[PDB]
Amino acid sequence: VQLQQPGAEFAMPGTSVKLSCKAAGYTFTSYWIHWLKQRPGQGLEWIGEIDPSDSYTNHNQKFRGKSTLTADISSSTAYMQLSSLTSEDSAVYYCAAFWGQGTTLTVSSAKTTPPSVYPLAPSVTLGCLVKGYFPESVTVTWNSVHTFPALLQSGLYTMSSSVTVPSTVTCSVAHPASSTTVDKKLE
């Protein structure tokens, strides 16, 4: 038994996104399908539910104006459509009957944007700032490493990485969505 959701979905603000949840290994109409939202560090929130056997739906009122739930008997999939998307809808959405692995929705108007790589220079600690790219993710290598989770800000990502050496150092940043690799030497 399992529920199949795509790993990631994207949408510009103001548009709609349709999240899919395919079922297998059990008769699709025997279980209600629930949807849940999880903003980073914000608990879980129940969105609503659909009975696949008759398409009856019910909603948490907080999400009723934004979420449309449907189910397709012919293909054993359920769908949640989210409308008038806002930066507050960037979240992981699970379907559950057993759970899906969740879909990570990112709301952004950005196009694929290679990062700017800035060297952070004064045990000596060095780092470099990787700013204003889209989308995730990015690979920063050095030549004690701390790589800090990116934060989405105004549709773009920024992250930072630090290295500590005892006393030539360069940081290498690969952004495969734009197929770019930048190397910055440090002062």
């Binding site: 608990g43 800035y118 600690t125 700032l129 630090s162």
Partner: protein
């Protein structure tokens, strides 16, 4: 939804041989009029541990009500078992979850290694100015970073990113970035990174002069 589920602590420090207890307090009584009380515990895809206070398949957990106050006790923690625990309710429409208790490994307290970095010449060249402050290998996770420009605290435009527990040191590292425009960065001359942590009565203060 409506009922609020307040969990404490946010991060519970654990030792892999010893017991552990967490709490979940509800805004409203979960005691339902059918006699039953619909409180569950989940562990994070998310999978639930307990219904109503009984386990059902985990097992080694407890498991204790009632009314508006609930607890989850592990007689002896293992590394399984390291994660976020959410409590849950259904008195009660709609169902609500708590904010979650994250379990991490208890290590000796350690102060952060603070390093402050000015905007590089390349970024100023592009009309932006970011000031970066690294707070490295500290424990526990709870920490407070404050930015000051010419001695005055700056709240706007500060993004903080934490790593997870290292798994080698059991420490955390966090990053604090203060992004200005290039024009207003040159408008000031003293940039201060101030860090308050339990390991000291006094904040670690790193700064530079533009």
């Amino acid at each position: 939804g409506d009922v609020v589920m307040t969990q404490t602590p946010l991060t519970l420090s654990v030792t892999i041989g010893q017991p552990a207890s967490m709490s979940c307090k509800s805004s409203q009584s979960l005691l339902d009029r059918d006699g039953k009380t619909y409180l569950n515990w989940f562990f994070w895809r998310l999978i639930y541990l307990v219904s109503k206070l009984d386990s059902g398949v985990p097992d080694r957990f407890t498991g204790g009500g009632s009314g508006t106050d609930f607890t989850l006790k592990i007689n002896r923690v293992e590394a399984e078992d390291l994660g976020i625990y959410y409590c849950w309710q259904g008195t009660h429409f709609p169902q609500t979850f708590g904010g979650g208790t994250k379990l991490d490994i208890k290590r000796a307290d350690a102060a952060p290694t603070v390093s402050i970095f000015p905007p590089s010449s390349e970024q100023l060249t592009s009309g932006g100015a970011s000031v970066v402050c690294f707070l490295n290998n500290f424990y526990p996770k709870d920490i407070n970073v404050k930015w000051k420009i010419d001695g005055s605290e700056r709240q706007n435009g500060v993004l903080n990113s934490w790593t997870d527990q290292d798994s080698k040191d059991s420490t955390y590292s966090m990053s604090s970035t203060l992004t200005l425009t290039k024009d207003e960065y040159e408008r000031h001359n003293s940039y201060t990174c101030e860090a308050t942590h339990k390991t000291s009565t006094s904040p670690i203060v790193k700064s530079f002069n533009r």
